[PDB]
């Protein structure tokens, strides 16, 4: 989903898509924690995400 969105639904700071650094690293870590905490409807949540 992240690559299909091309980091547009992820967001970025001062760069298109996303540069491989600490900002995107922390963003992805928090996003994965959110996905883990999503719960059972998380599949559909990512579906319309």
């Amino acid at each position: 989903v992240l690559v299909i969105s091309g980091f547009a639904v992820l967001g970025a700071k001062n760069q298109p898509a996303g540069q491989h650094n600490i900002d995107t690293l922390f963003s992805l870590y928090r996003f994965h924690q959110w996905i883990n905490g999503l719960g059972n409807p998380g599949s559909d949540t990512l579906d319309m995400l």
């Binding site: 989903v1 996905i35 883990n36 905490g37 999503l38 719960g39 059972n40 998380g42 599949s43 990512l46």
Partner: protein, 49 residues
């Protein structure tokens, strides 16, 4: 006398325990994804049977 203690400074009122909120459990769930098929290549018709 001002702080309502004993002669040796021992508090005259027992301090409340203030029982903590204590931690909670964590949960995780499953996530699914969907895909389509590949383009059907027109099979080059051989001569065999």
């Amino acid at each position: 006398l001002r702080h309502n203690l004993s002669i040796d400074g021992q508090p005259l009122s027992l301090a409340i325990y203030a029982e903590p909120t204590d931690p909670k459990a964590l949960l995780t769930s499953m996530v699914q994804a969907s895909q389509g098929g590949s383009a059907v290549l027109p099979g080059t018709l051989s001569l065999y049977r």
